[PDB]
Amino acid sequence: GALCVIRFDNLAEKTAEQIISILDDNKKTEYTRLLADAIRSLRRSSKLVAGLPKD
Questions:
Q1: The dihedral of CA 12, 18, 19, 24: what is its sign?
Q2: Which residues contact 24 (CB under 8 A, 6 or more apart)?
Q3: Structural contact between residues 33 and 26, judged by C-beta atoms closer than 8 angstroms
């Protein structure tokens, strides 16, 4: 099924549980889907963490 030539001679798990514990220690648990989407959007480059917004 291909062309041929024939010739003869862990770091994500603990950070995830940290963030889950932070969200469950407070009453902000409906913000989990949005956090997942925002981080998978941060996936693009590493220079987007220093430019996160403020209020």
A1: positive
A2: none
A3: no
